[PDB]
Design an enzyme around this catalytic site. Structure first.
Site, PDB file in Angstrom:
ATOM      1  N   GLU A   1       0.811  -1.215   0.000  1.00  0.00           N
ATOM      2  CA  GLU A   1       0.000   0.000   0.000  1.00  0.00           C
ATOM      3  C   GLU A   1       0.843   1.264   0.000  1.00  0.00           C
ATOM      4  O   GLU A   1       1.921   1.290   0.577  1.00  0.00           O
ATOM      5  CB  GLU A   1      -0.902  -0.002   1.236  1.00  0.00           C
ATOM      6  CG  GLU A   1      -1.851  -1.173   1.246  1.00  0.00           C
ATOM      7  CD  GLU A   1      -2.286  -1.582   2.633  1.00  0.00           C
ATOM      8  OE1 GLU A   1      -3.360  -2.198   2.737  1.00  0.00           O
ATOM      9  OE2 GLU A   1      -1.560  -1.319   3.611  1.00  0.00           O
TER      10      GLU A   1
ATOM     11  N   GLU B   1     -11.523  -4.127  -1.505  1.00  0.00           N
ATOM     12  CA  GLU B   1     -10.945  -5.348  -0.974  1.00  0.00           C
ATOM     13  C   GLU B   1     -11.310  -5.441   0.501  1.00  0.00           C
ATOM     14  O   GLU B   1     -11.562  -4.424   1.139  1.00  0.00           O
ATOM     15  CB  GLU B   1      -9.436  -5.229  -1.124  1.00  0.00           C
ATOM     16  CG  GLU B   1      -8.646  -6.497  -1.127  1.00  0.00           C
ATOM     17  CD  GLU B   1      -7.188  -6.205  -1.430  1.00  0.00           C
ATOM     18  OE1 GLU B   1      -6.815  -6.199  -2.619  1.00  0.00           O
ATOM     19  OE2 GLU B   1      -6.423  -5.931  -0.481  1.00  0.00           O
TER      20      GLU B   1
HETATM   21  O1  LIG Z   1      -1.723  -2.524   5.994  1.00  0.00           O
HETATM   22  C1  LIG Z   1      -2.436  -3.731   6.225  1.00  0.00           C
HETATM   23  C2  LIG Z   1      -3.867  -3.452   6.666  1.00  0.00           C
HETATM   24  O2  LIG Z   1      -3.785  -2.610   7.834  1.00  0.00           O
HETATM   25  C3  LIG Z   1      -5.038  -2.274   8.422  1.00  0.00           C
HETATM   26  O3  LIG Z   1      -5.694  -3.392   8.957  1.00  0.00           O
HETATM   27  C4  LIG Z   1      -6.014  -3.320  10.362  1.00  0.00           C
HETATM   28  C5  LIG Z   1      -7.464  -3.730  10.588  1.00  0.00           C
HETATM   29  O4  LIG Z   1      -8.332  -2.860   9.875  1.00  0.00           O
HETATM   30  C6  LIG Z   1      -7.772  -3.679  12.086  1.00  0.00           C
HETATM   31  O5  LIG Z   1      -9.096  -4.141  12.319  1.00  0.00           O
HETATM   32  C7  LIG Z   1      -6.780  -4.553  12.861  1.00  0.00           C
HETATM   33  O6  LIG Z   1      -7.025  -5.894  12.566  1.00  0.00           O
HETATM   34  C8  LIG Z   1      -6.249  -6.863  13.300  1.00  0.00           C
HETATM   35  C9  LIG Z   1      -5.257  -7.546  12.354  1.00  0.00           C
HETATM   36  O7  LIG Z   1      -4.554  -8.599  13.042  1.00  0.00           O
HETATM   37  C10 LIG Z   1      -5.433  -9.624  13.529  1.00  0.00           C
HETATM   38  O8  LIG Z   1      -4.658 -10.591  14.119  1.00  0.00           O
HETATM   39  C11 LIG Z   1      -6.413  -9.035  14.547  1.00  0.00           C
HETATM   40  O9  LIG Z   1      -7.314 -10.044  14.996  1.00  0.00           O
HETATM   41  C12 LIG Z   1      -7.199  -7.898  13.895  1.00  0.00           C
HETATM   42  O10 LIG Z   1      -8.055  -7.279  14.850  1.00  0.00           O
HETATM   43  O11 LIG Z   1      -5.439  -4.185  12.560  1.00  0.00           O
HETATM   44  C13 LIG Z   1      -5.104  -4.257  11.158  1.00  0.00           C
HETATM   45  C14 LIG Z   1      -3.619  -3.946  11.026  1.00  0.00           C
HETATM   46  O12 LIG Z   1      -3.294  -2.687  11.601  1.00  0.00           O
HETATM   47  C15 LIG Z   1      -5.950  -1.574   7.412  1.00  0.00           C
HETATM   48  O13 LIG Z   1      -7.234  -1.372   7.986  1.00  0.00           O
HETATM   49  C16 LIG Z   1      -6.091  -2.415   6.142  1.00  0.00           C
HETATM   50  O14 LIG Z   1      -6.835  -1.696   5.169  1.00  0.00           O
HETATM   51  C17 LIG Z   1      -4.714  -2.763   5.581  1.00  0.00           C
HETATM   52  O15 LIG Z   1      -4.871  -3.618   4.454  1.00  0.00           O
END
Ligand SMILES: OC[C@H]1O[C@H](O[C@H]2[C@H](O)[C@@H](O)[C@@H](O[C@@H]3CO[C@@H](O)[C@H](O)[C@H]3O)O[C@@H]2CO)[C@H](O)[C@@H](O)[C@@H]1O
Ligand SMILES: OC[C@H]1O[C@H](O[C@H]2[C@H](O)[C@@H](O)[C@@H](O[C@@H]3CO[C@@H](O)[C@H](O)[C@H]3O)O[C@@H]2CO)[C@H](O)[C@@H](O)[C@@H]1O
Ligand code: CA
Length: 516
Positions: free
Chosen positions: A172, A367
């Protein structure tokens, strides 16, 4: 859809391939079977990461596109299409990641200074992608890689639908502002990543360039800096996010900071179009992350988006249009919370981006951020995709649906659809001067019964004396709908008497005629 339109005629669904190479998760023969199955469920193409660390591992110009060519052969065998992502970022490399493919180690030796990597406010070094400041190394290495990849993929141009570029970490266009090692992971505020000596020097020269001298700088900022070396990035990121950003200094630093990403966009877009245009003549795109946390924080507004480089989305999207790149927003399945401590507003975010992209005429793709295991999420994705003009949606990831028939079926039904042009005709409509006729229905493609912003507008055919319109509907899906009149003031006046249906929507263009 928004303002009176329907779903995008060009909508297509894509499936994301696994992180590991195919021969590690299955075998080429089964993979082809899986592709024919995915194709059966409405998927048009498979998007896949081709890692820089794999393709130019051993040294400068020591390329290895054998995997990529073998992958393409199986895609051709399965009668599918592919969207390669030239991944110049690192894969995994953390605790229990499903991969670990760092960028070529020899690249770091191209410089003696700290120009190639990032350093946070607290001194955390990040090396999962080249710092966009080092444009000289990027122009050379990316140009070489893009041109070499194009040559290697030339024989498979027939199965290539679009090409993706990696604008930064996780593929990204952004700064590595949210990482566990830096203590900035979700739902925390991000940290600025411009603390290398090279970054400090660039900001300084950027400032002196627009103002000329320290005396002019001090006039504009209303500061009392004694020397040019005092020109530095935020010493306290939290204080800057709280109120520093409001100052003339804050506006300037944020302009420079996001500007680096904008310039990187135009550079990689230029190199990509040079390399791929004549040969493939396919769309090229890049991704923007969905940094939805700390969005509506009262004290530190947008405390996670700013450190990531997202200050003015409109100005950012302008860079994509000039570089001639399609945009892919990576967060469609979530909903707004907006409460402490996360202040997460994912849906508002997507709505903002979609609106801007559409105003500017930038082809928009979506996505999901996290793996979907519930039908309801597919439902949320459908609402955004079919009402905000998305040209495509990519499902992350392969295994989630490939090994779950139920989930696969719900995807086919809800998102694996083929748009088809149809004509809806309504007779006997009791309209008054200033009355507009709309239709709304059950599926997301029809606005889910919404009469405020998602209804599809009909028009009066002076010749045939009635209301009709060419609406794009999902082929082979059962639909239900009703026409309704909207007064001059925008309020619903009345509804069609009997509820209509089309079970299912014909694969061929025809018309559905009904009386009020
Ligand atoms: O750059 C990668 C990705 O980052 C962001 O994703 C966030 C996501 O929106 C959050 O809800 C949070 O999710 C975590 C991810 O790890 C799992 O193990 C947990 O269970 C989730 O709760 O954090 C991620 C990462 O910071 C962004 O929103 C997204 O668009 C992008 O592709
Ligand atoms: O390059 C000049 C100067 O920039 C940085 O200081 C910024 C600071 O990061 C901003 O948040 C903002 O802070 C002011 C300080 O005065 C308070 O009264 C206001 O409430 C804040 O808004 O502006 C300063 C510069 O004016 C950097 O930290 C520093 O090292 C550097 O010299
Ligand atoms: Ca090279």
């Amino acid at each position: 859809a928004v303002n009176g339109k329907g779903m995008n005629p060009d909508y297509k669904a894509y499936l994301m391939a696994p992180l590991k190479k195919i021969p590690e998760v299955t075998n080429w023969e089964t993979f082809e079977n899986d592709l024919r199955w995915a194709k059966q469920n409405g998927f048009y193409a498979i998007t896949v990461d081709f890692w820089w660390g794999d393709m130019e591992k051993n040294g400068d110009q020591q390329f290895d596109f054998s995997y990529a060519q073998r992958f393409a052969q199986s895609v051709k065998n399965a009668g599918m299409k592919m969207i390669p992502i030239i991944s110049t970022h690192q894969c995994g490399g953390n605790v229990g990641d499903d991969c670990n493919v760092p960028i070529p180690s020899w690249v770091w030796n191209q410089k003696s200074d700290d120009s190639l990597y990032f350093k946070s406010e607290t001194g955390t070094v990040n090396k999962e992608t080249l710092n966009p400041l080092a444009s000289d190394v990027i122009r050379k290495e990316y140009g070489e890689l893009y041109t070499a990849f194009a040559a290697a993929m030339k024989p498979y141009k027939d199965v290539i639908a679009k090409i993706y570029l990696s604008g930064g970490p996780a593929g990204e266009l952004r700064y590595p502002s949210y990482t566990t090692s830096d203590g900035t992971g979700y739902p925390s505020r991000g940290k600025f990543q411009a603390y290398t000596e090279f970054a400090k020097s660039k900001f300084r020269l950027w400032v002196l360039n627009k103002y000329g001298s320290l005396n002019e700088v001090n006039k504009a900022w209303g500061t009392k800096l004694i020397s040019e070396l005092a020109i530095l990035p935020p010493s306290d990121g939290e204080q800057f996010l709280m109120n520093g950003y409001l100052s003339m200094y804050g506006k300037d630093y944020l302009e420079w900071y996001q500007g680096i990403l904008e310039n990187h966009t135009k550079l990689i877009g230029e190199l990509a179009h040079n390399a791929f245009d004549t040969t493939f003549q396919v769309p090229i795109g890049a991704k923007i992350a969905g940094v939805h946390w700390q969005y509506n924080n009262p004290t530190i507004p947008h405390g996670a988006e700013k450190p990531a480089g997202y200050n003015d989305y409109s100005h950012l999207l302008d860079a994509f249009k000039s570089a001639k790149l399609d945009v892919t927003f990576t967060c469609l399945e979530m909903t707004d919370k907006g409460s402490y401590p996360e202040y997460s507003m994912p849906k508002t975010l997507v709505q903002n981006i979609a609106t801007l992209a559409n105003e500017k005429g930038i082809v928009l793709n979506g996505e999901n951020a996290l793996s979907i295991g519930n039908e309801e999420e597919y439902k949320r994705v459908a609402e955004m995709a079919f009402n905000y003009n998305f040209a495509g949606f990519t499902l992350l990831r392969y295994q989630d649906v490939m090994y779950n028939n139920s989930l696969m079926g719900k995807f086919k039904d809800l998102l694996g659809v083929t748009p088809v042009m149809q004509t809806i005709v309504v007779k006997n409509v009791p309209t008054t001067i200033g009355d507009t006729v709309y239709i709304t229905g059950n599926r997301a493609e029809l606005g889910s019964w919404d009469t405020k912003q998602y209804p599809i507008q009909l028009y009066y055919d002076s010749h045939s004396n009635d209301w009709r319109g060419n609406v794009v509907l999902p082929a082979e899906r059962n639909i239900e709908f009703k026409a309704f009149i909207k007064s001059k003031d925008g309020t619903v006046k009345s509804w069609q008497t009997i509820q209509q249906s089309w079970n299912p929507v014909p694969l061929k263009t025809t018309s559905h005629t009904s009386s009020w």
